[PDB]
Amino acid sequence: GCNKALCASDVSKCLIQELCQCRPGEGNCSCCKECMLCLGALWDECCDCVGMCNPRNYSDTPPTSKSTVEELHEPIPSLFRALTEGDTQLNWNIVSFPVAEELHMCTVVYFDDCMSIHQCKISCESMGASKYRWFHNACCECIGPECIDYGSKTVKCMNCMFGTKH
Amino acid sequence: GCNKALCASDVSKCLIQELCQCRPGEGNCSCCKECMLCLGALWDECCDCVGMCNPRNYSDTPPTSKSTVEELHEPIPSLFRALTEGDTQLNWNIVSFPVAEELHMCTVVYFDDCMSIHQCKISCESMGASKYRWFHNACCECIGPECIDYGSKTVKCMNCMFGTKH
């Protein structure tokens, strides 16, 4: 957790001054601002040592955790509805879920085969979608005109689940 | 706009069949699903030619238009408030705006100097932030515990506005 070699010198220096005596983890941390200033440049690599921040290296960042979202210029909502409602394309997985779940209803299209971001924007753009979300596992999710936000965080698109549990 | 060389053959073929006679741009487009099927693989590169989708190359995608958003594991809201409320760090620009504007109040921290995404996550993580948004101009925006969503789309962080008008 704590990087002892980098932090042992400076981290102890604050402790002698008696800073960083307050745990943010439960309750208010009055000293938190003072503790950060005493650490200075080492706060990023040493806030764990004083308990002010989560341990540095414990989780292996799944690729799905990142997604990149852009809003398409000049959306064409009528097209998006027309291609969604009817017998959908096999390449397309269509999910409608209640709007504001991610935080009437929000409908998104999940492309099957994994694709590059630039293709994903183009494919959504050809669909008239208001927005697209690109998971860093490379799953592509077009966002319908109705949807308030960026749609579901779930990597629900078939034939590219790499980056998900089991 | 239209890529004549790729699309002239196939696009005309649908027109002879009398598909793609309906404009999505105003009103319902009944034929839109049929038009896409007739184009098939060329829909991405040729939907513009039939008017079903926006012209291919007209806008120079600003870097700020993309942003990548991840939700931090194990946020520490007390720390985020403590370092925000008081006399803020010069490196940090603190913006509070009403919550749900982007779609009580949402507070975000805009790092000054432009930084890599991995540093941006770490810097937000040391701050206890629930989430971070990284603009592809490389501006970094930590997201406060209060904020419902991913915070402001604006690239409001000082000393890295590259990717914005004028």
Numbering used by the authors:
A (entry chain A), B (entry chain A): 25 to 127, 165 to 227
Could you pull the original sentences from the published paper?
The structure of TWSG1 reveals a modular architecture, comprising an α-helical N-terminal domain (NTD, Cys26–Arg80) connected by an extended 18 Å-long linker to a mixed-α/β C-terminal domain (CTD, Pro87–Phe223). The NTD of TWSG1 folds into a compact bundle of three α-helices locked by 7 disulfides. The CTD of TWSG1 is stabilized by 5 disulfide bonds (VIII–XII) and contains a sheet comprised of 5 antiparallel β-strands which constitute its core. Remarkably, a relatively small NTD of ~50 amino acid residues contains 7 disulfide bonds and thus serves as a stable, rigid scaffold suitable to mediate TWSG1 interactions with its binding partners.
TWSG1 binds BMPs and their antagonist Chordin to control BMP signaling during embryonic development, kidney regeneration and cancer.
